[PDB]
Amino acid sequence: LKKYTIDLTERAEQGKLDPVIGRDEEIRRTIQVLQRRTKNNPVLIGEPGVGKTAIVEGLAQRIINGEVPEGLKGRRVLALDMGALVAGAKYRGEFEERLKGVLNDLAKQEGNVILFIDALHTMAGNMLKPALARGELHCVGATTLDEYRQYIEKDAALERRFQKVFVAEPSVEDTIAILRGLKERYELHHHVQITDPAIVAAATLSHRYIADRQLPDKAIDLIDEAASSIRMQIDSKPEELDRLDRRIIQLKLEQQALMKESDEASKKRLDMLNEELSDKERQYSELEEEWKAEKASLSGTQTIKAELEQAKIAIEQARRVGDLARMSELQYGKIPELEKQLEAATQLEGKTMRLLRNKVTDAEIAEVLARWTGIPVSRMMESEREKLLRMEQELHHRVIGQNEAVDAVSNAIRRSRAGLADPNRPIGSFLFLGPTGVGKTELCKALANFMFDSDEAMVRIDMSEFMEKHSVSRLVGAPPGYVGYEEGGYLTEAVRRRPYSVILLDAVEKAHPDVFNILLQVLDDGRLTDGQGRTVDFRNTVVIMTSNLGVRETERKSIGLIHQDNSTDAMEEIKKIFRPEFINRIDEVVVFHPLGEQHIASIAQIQLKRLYKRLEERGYEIHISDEALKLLSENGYDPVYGARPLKRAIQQQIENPLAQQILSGELVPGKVIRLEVNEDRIVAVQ
Amino acid sequence: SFLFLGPTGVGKTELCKALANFMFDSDEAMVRIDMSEFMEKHSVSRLVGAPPGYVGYEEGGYLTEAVRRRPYSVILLDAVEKAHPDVFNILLQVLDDGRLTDGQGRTVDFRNTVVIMTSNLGVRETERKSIGLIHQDNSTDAMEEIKKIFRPEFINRIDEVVVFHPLGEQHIASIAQIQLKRLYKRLEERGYEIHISDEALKLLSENGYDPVYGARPLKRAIQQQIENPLAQQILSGELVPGKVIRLEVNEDRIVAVQ
Amino acid sequence: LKKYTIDLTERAEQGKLDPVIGRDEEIRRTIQVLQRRTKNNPVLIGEPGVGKTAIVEGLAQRIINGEVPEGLKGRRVLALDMGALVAGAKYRGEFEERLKGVLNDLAKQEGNVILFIDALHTMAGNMLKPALARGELHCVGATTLDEYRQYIEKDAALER
Amino acid sequence: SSIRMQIDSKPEELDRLDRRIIQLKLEQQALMKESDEASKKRLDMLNEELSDKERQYSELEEEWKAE
Ligand SMILES: Nc1ncnc2c1ncn2[C@@H]1O[C@H](COP(=O)(O)OP(=O)(O)OP(O)(O)=S)[C@@H](O)[C@H]1O
Numbered sequence A: 001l002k003k004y005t006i007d008l009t010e011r012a013e014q015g016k017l018d019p020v021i022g023r024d025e026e027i028r029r030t031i032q033v034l035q036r037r038t039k040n041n042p043v044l045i046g047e048p049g050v051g052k053t054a055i056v057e058g059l060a061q062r063i064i065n066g067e068v069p070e071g072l073k074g075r076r077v078l079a080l081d082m083g084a085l086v087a088g089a090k091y092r093g094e095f096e097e098r099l100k101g102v103l104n105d106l107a108k109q110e111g112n113v114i115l116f117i118d119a120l121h122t123m124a125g126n127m128l129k130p131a132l133a134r135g136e137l138h139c140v141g142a143t144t145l146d147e148y149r150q151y152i153e154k155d156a157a158l159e160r161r162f163q164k165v166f167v168a169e170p171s172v173e174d175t176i177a178i179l180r181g182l183k184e185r186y187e188l189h190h191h192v193q194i195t196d197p198a199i200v201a202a203a204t205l206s207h208r209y210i211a212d213r214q215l216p217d218k219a220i221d222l223i224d225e226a227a228s229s230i231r232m233q234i235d236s237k238p239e240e241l242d243r244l245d246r247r248i249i250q251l252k253l254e255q256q257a258l259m260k261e262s263d264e265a266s267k268k269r270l271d272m273l274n275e276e277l278s279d280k281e282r283q284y285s286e287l288e289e290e291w292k293a294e295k296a297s298l299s300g301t302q303t304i305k306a307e308l309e310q311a312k313i314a315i316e317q318a319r320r321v322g323d324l325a326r327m328s329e330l331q332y333g334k335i336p337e338l339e340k341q342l343e344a345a346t347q348l349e350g351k352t353m354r355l356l357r358n359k360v361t362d363a364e365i366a367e368v369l370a371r372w373t374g375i376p377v378s379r380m381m382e383s384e385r386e387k388l389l390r391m392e393q394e395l396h397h398r399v400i401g402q403n404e405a406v407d408a409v410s411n412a413i414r415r416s417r418a419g420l421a422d423p424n425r426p427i428g429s430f431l432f433l434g435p436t437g438v439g440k441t442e443l444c445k446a447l448a449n450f451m452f453d454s455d456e457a458m459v460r461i462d463m464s465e466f467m468e469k470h471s472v473s474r475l476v477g478a479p480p481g482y483v484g485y486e487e488g489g490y491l492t493e494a495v496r497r498r499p500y501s502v503i504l505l506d507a508v509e510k511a512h513p514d515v516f517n518i519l520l521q522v523l524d525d526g527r528l529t530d531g532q533g534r535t536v537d538f539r540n541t542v543v544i545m546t547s548n549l550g551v552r553e554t555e556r557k558s559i560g561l562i563h564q565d566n567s568t569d570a571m572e573e574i575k576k577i578f579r580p581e582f583i584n585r586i587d588e589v590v591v592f593h594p595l596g597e598q599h600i601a602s603i604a605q606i607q608l609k610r611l612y613k614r615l616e617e618r619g620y621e622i623h624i625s626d627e628a629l630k631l632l633s634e635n636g637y638d639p640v641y642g643a644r645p646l647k648r649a650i651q652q653q654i655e656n657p658l659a660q661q662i663l664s665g666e667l668v669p670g671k672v673i674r675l676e677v678n679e680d681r682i683v684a685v686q
Numbered sequence B: 001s002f003l004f005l006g007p008t009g010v011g012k013t014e015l016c017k018a019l020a021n022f023m024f025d026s027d028e029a030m031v032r033i034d035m036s037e038f039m040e041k042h043s044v045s046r047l048v049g050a051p052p053g054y055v056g057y058e059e060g061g062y063l064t065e066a067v068r069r070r071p072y073s074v075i076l077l078d079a080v081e082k083a084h085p086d087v088f089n090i091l092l093q094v095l096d097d098g099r100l101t102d103g104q105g106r107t108v109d110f111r112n113t114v115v116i117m118t119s120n121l122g123v124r125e126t127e128r129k130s131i132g133l134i135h136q137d138n139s140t141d142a143m144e145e146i147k148k149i150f151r152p153e154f155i156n157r158i159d160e161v162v163v164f165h166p167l168g169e170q171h172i173a174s175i176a177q178i179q180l181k182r183l184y185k186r187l188e189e190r191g192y193e194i195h196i197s198d199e200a201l202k203l204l205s206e207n208g209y210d211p212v213y214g215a216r217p218l219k220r221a222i223q224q225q226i227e228n229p230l231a232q233q234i235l236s237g238e239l240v241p242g243k244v245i246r247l248e249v250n251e252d253r254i255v256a257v258q
Numbered sequence C: 001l002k003k004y005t006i007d008l009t010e011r012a013e014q015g016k017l018d019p020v021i022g023r024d025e026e027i028r029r030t031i032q033v034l035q036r037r038t039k040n041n042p043v044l045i046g047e048p049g050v051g052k053t054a055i056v057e058g059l060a061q062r063i064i065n066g067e068v069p070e071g072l073k074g075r076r077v078l079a080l081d082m083g084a085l086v087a088g089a090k091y092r093g094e095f096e097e098r099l100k101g102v103l104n105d106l107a108k109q110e111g112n113v114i115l116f117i118d119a120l121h122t123m124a125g126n127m128l129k130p131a132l133a134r135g136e137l138h139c140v141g142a143t144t145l146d147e148y149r150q151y152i153e154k155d156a157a158l159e160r
Numbered sequence D: 001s002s003i004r005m006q007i008d009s010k011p012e013e014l015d016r017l018d019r020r021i022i023q024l025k026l027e028q029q030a031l032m033k034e035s036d037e038a039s040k041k042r043l044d045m046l047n048e049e050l051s052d053k054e055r056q057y058s059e060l061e062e063e064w065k066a067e
């Protein structure tokens, strides 16, 4: 006991531990395990962070407070580790005799002292089971499920001496009370305020968006992180002081470099920069002056906070000794007087200046969790309003036509930023049923290039690969008994990388209806469980389907066949598999339409922009006759095909004599090329 | 052991979640499993675990794991057309006797745990055959796909075969005013309130209805009709918090007004 | 420390280390996670092409240049060798006899060091969990993506 | 073991009445402390409720002792 153990009760006696609120039936349950005749030793099972070690802690706190039931009053709790154990036993019999010696140390401890084991699934086996049988080994363990089972579930005393107690992830409100317990502890370490919408929004959004770590733990390190952020901000200077300090240090290192001169006053023709340099000195004294003012304010605030807690630990040690009149004149007396005038003074300090930031606040929490996912609230103060309010203009840079479609998509993303969508659904559930040659993939690339500013994050998946049973085994993963079980799937791993992004599907109809049903999982609800064995949240990505159910009837429907009927044999495979919650609870069947003249001329222009971009990389510039654009616009159109073979007319009419002459060396860089229809076709000229 | 058949329109797993929030006070504990994952041969190696010596053995299948953790729960089964007949017969060891072994080497109790199967064999044909199909005849063409694998051991050893039915329009009014409430929670998130006329709510009633499609154009008819201009006026900075919105109808498209 | 580990800050002071350009939000993010009171243990994830141990050594460059915010300027950084610890694994029992004494030395510098760990999926382990639990051991890890996937993602203390 | 706990623990009339008397002792500790004795020492109702709950608490206390 000299070497191997740590008294928890004494570290409680220094108040080093932190209080734990609740779980009362768990505590009575465990004490019921403790003062039994046999099976004296309980098991705590759950997830990590749920508070198993902290349940042991607050138990020991209740013991040193004397609030324990009788018999246990005075009985001590010590935690035994490994690591002091596993010292230099290179030869046989050493470690065994250590453990035997501390078992006899327990024997002369006469049943008084409760032992604790953390990480029961570490640990012998022979040496404990009779002492376990007698009840002499009076211990407590803690682990998770799989560590328990795969440790072993099935050793005779190692199940027989022990009893399982489920902790579980508690409610929102319980964790709220926990944060109400620990908020003062973290104002001690973290020197700032605590706002109530910060903690209730922290519990709510941590419950919504983090899908791996549990309450309370995710709210806890939300608080620890954000308070760390505010100390990080206040510890440094504000960025106006920093960049304005950069021009201050820039100019004083400019003349500081320029003091070493032949005749310094002669080459000081820059006398106004000497004067304005003294202005940087004075202005710097202003910024540092307000800076030390704010440091005096919040520094004094941190002192009276910590000294206030010294009054509180003082009054609790006074609760241990019980001198009621002194306690009543202190906590009913001198301390809350200085508290309320102290808060009037510190709110006067909070309103006396502006660069001070003392609250937590909930918006900071929204920025942190927003940084883990990608959905902020803080763009509202930012210049989101421009690019959001020209979202139709932004997409109508690189997609002409179909205003209905871009308005539909745009309104969906706008109400996603509003927060109006069902949290228990995916955001976007889209179906584009239009003709060919219309720029579906243009729209998808436009949107990925809108948010994530590339066409990387757009997760393209062909569905024409898929006909058979094995298709879902492709995208989802393999069952166990196969190497692909160790591997996993495309999709599950893919959104498990980055949560909230774009998922793209192409010619969706050809697959099996099994595909469509697991779509109906992730579109009715937005969850899917992999073959590996874990649920995957989809509920804040956007899925997009452009396809060809309707297309072989879309090419004959326009105009004259009704959108109900191509909605119907489009709805052939659909109502074959999908139900009213799908079609009524997807976003839209989006219809497209063919193009006219200025469509084709416009996409000729923005098509040419990339050509000017690449030749602009190569040092060439091109001027084009309007008539050449007229002939190309004459060439590109065909009704059955739409916008596509315009590109063919571009490359074969333009690019081939251009390629011949550009490798001919006739064309010299720096001299801007001109394009003339000095033919029946387009010719090139310098 | 209940099977849920007929048309849909109705929120079958919504009723399941009503039980999950009923007795377990949340929809978390209600373990849900798709059958349309499970059409393969290899599906059993997903749900029950692996045979010895191979990849995935010492980890087990999460069904027996979840039941063996907390014994007496509610197990959700879904869209049962798409499964495999062995899973039907492993399931026949479920409904008979309430016990089931794994690949790992032991059995798991079921005998105080409810299994619920939402399925579509009705709504695969009943919303098509809306004239003349009775509960017995729906059991017959149910027993087209059903009768081969599912036998009177299966079909007798399920408890009750609950058929459903389409929706009254006042029901749809009830669902709509249900769906308003969480939107009012979104308003109390931001400090707002919607008033509505009776008549604009009547517009949502006359728009949301579809006989074949049940009530289910309701919510997307709602937020598609009203939340898009709402999101415009909010994201504009136009709409001030601390105020009341009324759903007026400047004309037959519903408009939100401060 | 002295027995096994290597001072990176000393190498930056001797100019042996390479500068980096940009990424101020990420190194600020790391500082932000280092100002935790507990679990104060950030992990870098990416390919080896993304150069993250260059990021931590350029962080050490910022520390020596004092452009780190305050409080950390008293601290110094060392990186851990696995091999000189683990190479004496002849019998069953000897490695932890080294490792616990190492942990006591970390308890002897008393929070004035900031530990770096590389190849976190290689990193024993049960003894690490309490010191990382309390936030006593103030360490920094960095590793690869599917190394973290075959680490185990649902491994109990280690996610936490 | 559990019924032995419920015996050895303090009973529910004893502990509920203990909470009510201890709230009445802390409220009494704030009420005997006067800012205006002629105003704050109007407290007669709190002190007769004090003696009342000392009667009830003391009697159930004594019955608990005898059992
Ligand atoms: N109810 C609670 N009240 C206060 N703090 C809590 C509570 N639950 C969890 N915590 C915190 O969560 C931390 C981790 O939980 P533990 O007590 O270690 O139990 P755990 O679930 O075994 O986690 P481990 O030790 O990683 S397996 C504790 O140290 C507390 O700081």
Ligand SMILES: Nc1ncnc2c1ncn2[C@@H]1O[C@H](COP(=O)(O)OP(=O)(O)OP(O)(O)=S)[C@@H](O)[C@H]1O
Pocket: A398, A399, A400, A401, A435, A436, A437, A438, A439, A440, A441, A442, A443, A546, A547, A603, A643, A644
């Ligand atoms: N409105 C448009 N704006 C710009 N380019 C367009 C437009 N319509 C078609 N295109 C061009 O046509 C090409 C093919 O269109 P896509 O973007 O692939 O969509 P699509 O017409 O439906 O054909 P898919 O993708 O095979 S279904 C694009 O790469 C563009 O070069």
Ligand SMILES: Nc1ncnc2c1ncn2[C@@H]1O[C@H](COP(=O)(O)OP(=O)(O)OP(O)(O)=S)[C@@H](O)[C@H]1O
Pocket: A520, A524, A579, A581, B008, B009, B010, B011, B012, B013, B014, B015, B079, B118, B119, B175, B215
């Ligand atoms: N009659 C109804 N009453 C209440 N909610 C309903 C009703 N009909 C549909 N819903 C809603 O519809 C959504 C999904 O209902 P579900 O429970 O999935 O119906 P379902 O029959 O289970 O469909 P599946 O899962 O494709 S078999 C939820 O938001 C329900 O609240």
Ligand SMILES: Nc1ncnc2c1ncn2[C@@H]1O[C@H](COP(=O)(O)OP(=O)(O)OP(O)(O)=S)[C@@H](O)[C@H]1O
Pocket: C018, C019, C020, C021, C047, C048, C049, C050, C051, C052, C053, C054, C055
């Ligand atoms: N922004 C950068 N600045 C400087 N060097 C960089 C940068 N990005 C990558 N590198 C270099 O990338 C190389 C490999 O990456 P490392 O920094 O060693 O860490 P890494 O990502 O783990 O790759 P490893 O070490 O091979 S596993 C190093 O030589 C770095 O110097």
